[model samples]
Target chain A: NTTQEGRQRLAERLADTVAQALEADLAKRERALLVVSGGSTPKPFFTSLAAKALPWARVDVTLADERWVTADDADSNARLVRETLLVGPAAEACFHPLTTDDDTPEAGVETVAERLESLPWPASAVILGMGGDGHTASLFPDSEQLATALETTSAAVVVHAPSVPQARITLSASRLADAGLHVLHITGNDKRRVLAEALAGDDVRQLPIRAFLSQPIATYWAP
Target chain B: NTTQEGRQRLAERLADTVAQALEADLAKRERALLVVSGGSTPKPFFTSLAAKALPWARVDVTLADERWVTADDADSNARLVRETLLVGPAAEACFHPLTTDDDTPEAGVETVAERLESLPWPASAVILGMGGDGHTASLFPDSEQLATALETTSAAVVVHAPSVPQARITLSASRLADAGLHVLHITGNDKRRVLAEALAGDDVRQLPIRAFLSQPIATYWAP
Candidate 1:
């Protein structure tokens, strides 16, 4: 039960919806948490969302998954976020980057976990991005840590997604499910078809996106 | 933005909503996970919900928190649930009690965590209860473990809530927030006022119920 549109409008509407949820959280608390995913898919949405008029100072932002690359590395998700989503009106939002001075993502897991431990629980919004391979966040198929990462009771875990990146720090499927708003943002006919297959199947090991199908998610897609 | 009703009807509607979510999950997988709170407040709700005509065999039940008491102990949440909720049509629903044979709750945290790891992530429905003290589940104010329990990235932790019976195991705010439906069931004018104050405050210490206010919870109340 979703509508299709050109990529131009999807980003705009996703930003608006995320803004609305954050505003509601702001009304009740001094701050709200905004957890976003990395990669080029959400770049436009983050750009559009960053410009929306809101009390950005009261917002706390973080990545759903972070590459083990340095902040200066082109592969760094935090770098792209700093250059884009963390600018404009949203620049005032406190950014909690998952990457730390620790040598490896596994070594930095505890430190990052402690740092992320303080955000408003059950994030205000966790907007996720999907790949053509049916992966979301760092829950990639065939990853050795897939089952543990997908465990609903798990907090956050470091994932070794061999196919994509060797190491990634990701908010476990459990934490993402707790987010106030779980929005699945994707575009193109291939993703639309992938999502359909995911909804029809139960093997999360084969299609990681199937992990979120049990809950009510707002899926935003465009041709 | 809420209405009042008798406990009987509230329990009925709560059961209906929990059923709808569980039924929805069952449609996607072979089984669904149902997480519930343990307190005198939900005693009747559990009884009523247990009798509902659901595919009980395909459901797994667990507690939001549990006192570190043996199943035979009168104050044990697990005992109450085992004797009450695991009856009638719901008897077949696999129950995962938080209490193990370990000497203390801290000693059993890892064991219980491994058991909970197998459930469907992001519970089908998580029905919670509140106290006049503004506490939900076992998250009490001024608890030694309050900060750890409130961490957004924490899984389940052993909470030594000062005012409570003490030495209890609680699903961290993160895991509870991840539950598909976070329903707060309460009654009476006093509790209504407490909830009002809690919703108005951002401090999780003074009012632990503030833990769930970030999410859109269906708070059911009665006069």
Candidate 2:
């Protein structure tokens, strides 16, 4: 699915996947998690998903990665998600931000990791976004910190991605793979071409998006 | 995807994915890389992939992670791949070992990283396995080097993981994610359940498997 309408359709279906898991978990348990990425590409999907009828109160929302800037910073992923996606019925869902009050992501990772540890495992779903550089979350290409950030078996680490200003803390690639459903939201020819490039091989430092080719990804793309 | 018959069928398809990618690269490119992990689960899959009549000469093989032992050591991931997977039609594929003669993985990381950097970026495929502890590759939970080793963007580092004697060097999660295809091969009810646990949430410290959950994993499991 690689068109605007196709992306919308994909969003609707993806929303269904999230809601179904939420419903199922709610039926048998007290909580379910809806993990998402923050970026322009996911806004429409988030809006569509936010309108869905579900017990949002039982759904816990979190980011795949975040910018270390203050919550008020325009560059903050939390701010984007907070302003755009955390509204409508979805407002009822609890959100756990990746950023902490600490001055640096390196110092904050300990706190963030400690706090996020309490969330339910195998989050009901995970939504990821890809940058032109093939980075998903803050896992940047050739970022001096790329390998540590992508550890599938380690906790989220601070990312010193050269392309970005502030350091970021991203859920480790391994942690992201643990989700029940992993959705990758991308758009435009550039992103598509990048995705294609990633599929060609594991030059993760050059194209960070390749790290995610392992899971069953519900990739929604548009022009 | 969890049944033995289902796993067998999936293995054939995974082999096709490898063959198709290898064939595609071989048609236009001089070489392609195939990255694999060592363990009990991938044996059949390796056997199946080895049978595929592709241009194995163009395929360069390496381990996703390894124990710090010599290639001759029974526990060595390189030894496992050499003895089992690199045979028959696939014998022509190049094999790169993470283990070097520096006595410690910590000391050998530089040489190993230098050697691996020359391989084609974005390997054709990466086949990984999961431990009950949720560690993938050598990115083990509770390892002192967990944070450094997980760096997806940095130079490959040595890992002093617990529960093992020889220190090991794993392709950073970032490095593994760089592969064109990332296949996670596991079997048995325990692994399936552990995978389920990993999918539940971000507990990379306790369950190292959470690290790789972000990507579109080609998960092959049987019980």
Candidate 3:
């Protein structure tokens, strides 16, 4: 899967899997929750998923993690999702952003958690992304809140990543693991090597992505 | 410059420029020092440069910065240079790596600087790469050694980059600025945006790349 065509095919298949999950949830529940992780890597998949014929109005969309920035900010996960995923018929989906007008993610987490309560307990489908350093969502290994985020009964917690400029709010590991369907989307040789290293170790503190690898998660990769 | 063909064209032009500089220096000096920055972005340019016809035996090759890893390590800039730039006709060029058997870059800097003195002063040509965070060489904004690396009279200094796992050794800004020719090699829309932001401000503490932007440097970019 080294070509653009190969990546497009992978995106389409991922979209199909997500669509099936949404449809299944819609058949049994009044509303379906879809949790998505954001980065440049997911742009094509977001585009493909947005084109899917789903009951968009019945779907509730939220981010797995978000930077402490306004939606207008270029680095905002909400901005990426809004510009890429919430388009066409999918624009009808109820969007619940993790960031607020508050100065920091720690101050906004409670309000975001309250808003998230409107959606179902467990997400119908969760799309996750991995960093080259093996961080999933915003759960960076260097973050002091990693242990708390991993074991918290709360849906989300504030993460202070030392490597990045912005504070982040990430869905707790317990919450993400509770999803009916989980997919780990990654690309490039660096990330593939990181994935291999994570698979070889059991230390979640060293590589945050290792927390999800032990769960029931499907991985989609492209070169 | 949004296509692979465009990138290859840029690579060829960059190779020509570097070759011309190397030839000009060889005419006056017994040996020419050609310093190159490493990363995936420069791979194509390195490949093109390696194919050029030159008296590589009279050229000394070195890195602008290097990770604290053995030459055999996958992350080694020296490994990348050897595999890419130091091939074909360029294989005859003497390579002086920045990293040593020392446990840390701080301990290796003095030794690396001593080895660098063997090459002629004021490098014949220096090729630099920029990170998305606007760092050039190993001069990261978050690094505690950034101020020292920026203003040091020494040829090189050790860098402790917070964002990256390994410590690094980078040529001091003054040393790099004294080069016969300077080229800022970058690619991608994100880097283009970061470059623009760096140009908009003169705060070296906020964006380390700003220090070099004030100097005479040619930028080669491909979308």
Candidate 4:
């Protein structure tokens, strides 16, 4: 039932918890979209999502992060979602990937900016993950993009210019806050500690996670 | 690269466009926790997600909002994720649903609060959508939760009590900003207009979405 900690027995139970919220939002919204965070932790939810048989064709998918590498790069979050969440009946769905595979990330942002300029509005659903360092998506606390990504009102920006990875393409809080629904997924303990610091409105540069939590939010974790 | 007008463009992109960004965080420093909004427009990305084959074992998923229903309910966002993004390999991943099968929309608060407490700190990433009214998640502009959700500090609160569709669960601004990354997805010219007004910064009460964009951001859009 409801408790200070809810029904979550551990961090691993996060997938089930997140699934419940998404199910509710999808049923309520017809033309829906889902945005996901990169990195590990959401894989189980992706697997469970594929088996449920949603109006696969109706849902649009995208990423909170896209590496500068090819869409199939082993470490790319885009590649991860394509393989884990876009398979089976879900494969029929469309995707607006963030990566243009540019060796120079900033250049990719220029190309991606042109590409993201044409599409539908207000996603039905969105999913995300957080880092223990208090970073989310490409909005790294110390990263060059953090200030703009965390504060800018633009739709997308060319960031991480000349960094090892491609310049990051991000959906500003202005865009994300406008979705019909939203979700956050996470796992582990140290990250949890970081969130606690964020709650106190700690330094934004030091605790970048504070940027997202500044709005109303619910985090799902499993350990 | 940085501007108050960015929030408007972000809304435009969420309404129309495709964009992505990869956030490679030091998983060791912080865990990735995410928060998001709901509605249409992100389905394609979700589909691609179900196709990806990432390190599922490390991920956990959670919803930013829920109807307080079970995974089987037709109005469940979690169910949608199951059918659309959780197919194939990702299906093997785990899930942590926000509400149980029996949660009624009105009584959903206390239980939701408890569930929220179990999650890790500072969401790693957050994907959110807005309403024409400028509401994000369930914190409608007219609702009292707006004030609580708007707090500069991280907090967990239950909204929409005694109200049918009105009841909701949300994180304070402090909580949402605490996430590592935050994306505010919006779409269409109409939203852009509202976002413009919100970006004016004086009408946040009338346009809760404005406050969502108060912090710098990496908005997503096209057109």
Candidate with the greatest DockQ versus the true structure: 4
**Candidate 1 lDDT over residue span B101-204, tens digit each:** 99988899988877877778778778788998988888888687888888845557898865775688888888887765567777665775676576555678
lDDT of 3 by residue, A9-120 (tens): 5565567567766876898999999999899888888998898778999999999999888889989999999999999989999999997888977778999888877678
Runs off by more than 4 Å, candidate 2: A1-223, B1-7
Candidate 1 lDDT (Cα, 0 to 1): 0.77
- The DockQ-derived docking category for candidate 4 is incorrect
Interface root-mean-square deviation, each candidate = 17.8, 13.1, 20.6, 14.2
C-alpha DockQ of every model: 0.01, 0.02, 0.01, 0.03
Q: How does each model score on TM-score?
A: 0.50, 0.50, 0.50, 0.46
In model 3, the runs with Cα more than 4 Å from the true position are A1-223
Model 4 clashing-pair count: 208
**Scored by CA lDDT, what does every candidate get?**
0.77, 0.73, 0.82, 0.56
Per-residue accuracy of model 2 over B85-187 as CA lDDT, tens digit each = 7899998888988877888776788898998998987776677888888888888887888887666575476777558776778788778777545566776
Model 4: residues >4 Å from true position, as ranges?
A1-30, A161-167, B1-223
- Deviation from native of the Cα of residue A4 in model 2, angstroms: 11
What range of 10 consecutive residues in model 3 chain A has the weakest lDDT sum? A1-10
Give me the iRMSD of candidate 1, please: 17.8
So what's the TM-score on candidate 4?
Answer: 0.46
